[PDB]
Structure 1
Amino acid sequence: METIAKHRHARSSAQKVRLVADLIRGKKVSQALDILTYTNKKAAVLVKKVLESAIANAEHNDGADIDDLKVTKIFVDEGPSMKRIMPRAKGRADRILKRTSHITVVVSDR
């Protein structure tokens, strides 16, 4: 498990935030930034700054190798709850959300 620096909370939905996690599984910790900073979305840049927070700690905090910590899973969760309004019908619809996200990175070793 080793390191889990998730970040809060974004403005985006968990759908756009989840679209990139699978790319960085298993075999990309050595050189993690290129796929994430050159796909310059408020998802990928967030998984970048997550990964960065998580692994700049790990090498110090344990004594492990910064190149063998295999970036094993990366999942996400929402919440708790947030609302705002835009009076489009001003008695019915009117009620936009922030489902928000926090990226459960889970890094681990080979």
Structure 2
Amino acid sequence: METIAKHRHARSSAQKVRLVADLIRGKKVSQALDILTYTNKKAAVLVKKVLESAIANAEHNDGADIDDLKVTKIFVDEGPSMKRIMPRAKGRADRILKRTSHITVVVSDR
């Protein structure tokens, strides 16, 4: 059973979300929501809502039983950055990168 759920254009960058995804990759959901809750990072708050969406689409578009529901697959691959100008010392200009990312959680029962 596939039942993906994803969050495109996640406005925290991929290297910082990808630390959080390296905790829940390969566990049950019941472990995952709590471990994401007590993790003291922001992308935990940004990926708990994605995994919570994956729960609801699993129960509501196809078969239920959240008890037997592993997070088999989760991958964060980066999205379109956003180009902004930074003024610096001595008249030069920088280009800061408001990077975004694409979170994908694929939850399954088997």
Q: Which stretch of the first structure deviates more once superposed, 73-82 or 88-97? A: 88-97
Q: 1:46 to 1:28 in 2, by over 3 A?
A: same
Cα deviation, 1:15-52, whole Å, max 9, x if unaligned, reads: 11100212213333124222111113221111211100
Stretches of structure 2 lacking an aligned partner (at least 5 in a row)? none
- Give the distance between the partners of 1:90 and 1:73, measured in 2 at CA: 48
Q: Which stretch of the first structure deviates more once superposed, 21-30 or 57-66? A: 21-30
Q: TM-score w.r.t. structure 1 length?
A: 0.83
- Give the distance between the partners of 1:27 and 1:66, measured in 2 at CA: 13
- Give the distance between the partners of 1:61 and 1:67, measured in 2 at CA: 17
Q: Where does residue 84 of structure 2 map in the other structure?
A: 84
Query: SS in structure 1 opposite 2:52?
Result: helix
Query: SS in structure 1 opposite 2:67?
Result: coil
Stretches of structure 1 lacking an aligned partner (at least 5 in a row)? none
Q: Report how far residue 12 of structure 1 moved.
A: 2.2
Query: SS in structure 2 opposite 1:96?
Result: strand
Q: 1:86 to 1:32 in 2, by over 3 A?
A: same
Answer whether contact 1:25 1:70 (CA < 8 A) is retained.
no
Q: Report how far residue 73 of structure 1 moved.
A: 1.9
- Percent identity between the aligned chains? 100
- Give the distance between the partners of 1:5 and 1:89, measured in 2 at CA: 44
Q: Where does residue 97 of structure 1 map in the other structure?
A: 97
Q: 1:27 to 1:78 in 2, by over 3 A?
A: closer
Q: Report how far residue 91 of structure 1 moved.
A: 6.0
Q: TM-score w.r.t. structure 2 length?
A: 0.83
Q: Which stretch of the first structure deviates more once superposed, 48-57 or 82-91? A: 82-91
Q: Report how far residue 87 of structure 1 moved.
A: 1.0
Q: Report how far residue 86 of structure 1 moved.
A: 1.4
